[PDB]
Ligand binder design. Sequence first.
Ligand SMILES: [Co+2]
Ligand SMILES: [Co+2]
Ligand SMILES: [Fe+2]
Ligand SMILES: [Fe+2]
Lengths: 314, 314
Amino acid sequence: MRIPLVGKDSIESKDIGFTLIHEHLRVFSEAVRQQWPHLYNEDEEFRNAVNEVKRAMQFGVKTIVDPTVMGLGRDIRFMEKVVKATGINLVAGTGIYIYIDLPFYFLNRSIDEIADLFIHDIKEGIQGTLNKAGFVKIAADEPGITKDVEKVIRAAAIANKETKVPIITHSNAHNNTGLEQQRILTEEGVDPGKILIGHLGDTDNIDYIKKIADKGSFIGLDRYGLDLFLPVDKRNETTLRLIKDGYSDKIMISHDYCCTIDMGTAKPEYKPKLAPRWSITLIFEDTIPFLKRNGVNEEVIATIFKENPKKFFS
Amino acid sequence: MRIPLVGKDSIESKDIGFTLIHEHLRVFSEAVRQQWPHLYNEDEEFRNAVNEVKRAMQFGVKTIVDPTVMGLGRDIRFMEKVVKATGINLVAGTGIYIYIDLPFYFLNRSIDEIADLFIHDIKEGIQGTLNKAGFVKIAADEPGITKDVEKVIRAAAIANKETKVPIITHSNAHNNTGLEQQRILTEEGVDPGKILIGHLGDTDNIDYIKKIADKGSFIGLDRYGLDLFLPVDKRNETTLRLIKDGYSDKIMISHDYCCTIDMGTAKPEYKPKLAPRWSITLIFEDTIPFLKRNGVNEEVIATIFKENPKKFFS
Ligand SMILES: [Co+2]
Ligand SMILES: [Co+2]
Ligand SMILES: [Fe+2]
Ligand SMILES: [Fe+2]
């Protein structure tokens, strides 16, 4: 059809339905898990992911896009288990997630070599399976656009032009990395409407967010629940403002929730402090009702969670 | 019963025999191999490692110390397959190999949690097996002693003090990282004679190397064949000079040979220029005969390849 799904036949974009554009079933450092498996519990990770997905589906979620890639512990076999146990539409991706340098493997390897890896996942399949990647994920954070971060961005552009799959990014909302990602990608021939600039919800700087949307890319208000980056009420005020200003056409919303994450920051005794209400269904429990209370109609909600994702994968 | 071996009973350190203190059976980036297995061929890797180790045993090598740790693709099960096919004494280690930052797993984690990881490998076993680590490996390079790099160094100190296993390091011969590693470790209470400061053979700056040995640590003239860091003839000159100046009892010699390495820098095309005669037996073909034809007696060669490793692990 058009959009590949983990453990299912691919579907036309018209069948995506209500979508969460940025959620993680599970995240871990590949090297750590590989060297110290005693630190992880496969059964527990599985129960948590299955339980989260089931609750999301009870609110009407039909598709989840999971941008777990190299550097975040992408595991296509774990994903297909969750799919088999829930019946969710799951879009997996390919890409590379780094802030500074690439793994030593890429020393003296061209940008084309890197792009070949993405294209392989898109055309052949992921990690020895026939499950194909439906988008490319790239990142940049506090260190900005370093040389290697820039190789990865250009590689994504190459993969997009060859395969037409969209691009999701991770960025730091406070240092201009999002704007730079969009610039570099679009200068390399990527259609701006095929890019989602991520974690823009981490800021309340409306002008910066409009600046990116105005250049034709989707804007990721995609960390709902992560108060440490920005409280739910601040995000809500920003989201409502953008909607009132007529930016529904570019807004995408999600939680960036990790049904499991191995970071030292994601410890249970830090949850009440940094992400008390953080879950894969927080937007149903708070954000969406807040928007409706403030005069946002059902057409707008549908545009954000249905039409936008559809255009993005079309 | 003192030095753990992979796939064998532990040995007394006095039984170690002729030893190669720094060689790799296989090296790769965990994240890359995990996300793109299509890039690797395990049969070739296994065949290459077995062939190299067998040729090494033909030259009288009894023991090989393999500092492949997190970040370099340590794989204890691959290692025991190689032992079963060769009968070599193989010492595995634990530790972390980074130049700049630690994997995100380590955000908000203490130096002690890191040490616990090393201590787990040494006392419990590696990757779910009963094969135990016989030393701790750490690294620092061009980027220098970063915060994360230092945290790892200090973790290694804790592990040494708890388990008594020696410490092997990777350093950059031109930026003082070696001397820094030695300083931080000794300050933390690590016996200098329990430290092998690695890759010092990459420079002909005899003064720098001597300073480190004078501080009481072993010096790694351990990259024989890697001409891109320093040609074999210049290495041999430094080695011979250090021996004549009476540093035999602090010198350790090796190849740092990777029977298989995944990085593009060390791939077939560049080998003829960067490392034309680089293998696990180069020192028997070139280095040792050079030393012996230049007034180095058999007692000195035994001190370097038998006595020094014995002390290091005592
Ligand atoms: Co992100
Ligand atoms: Co090294
Ligand atoms: Fe994410
Ligand atoms: Fe090495």
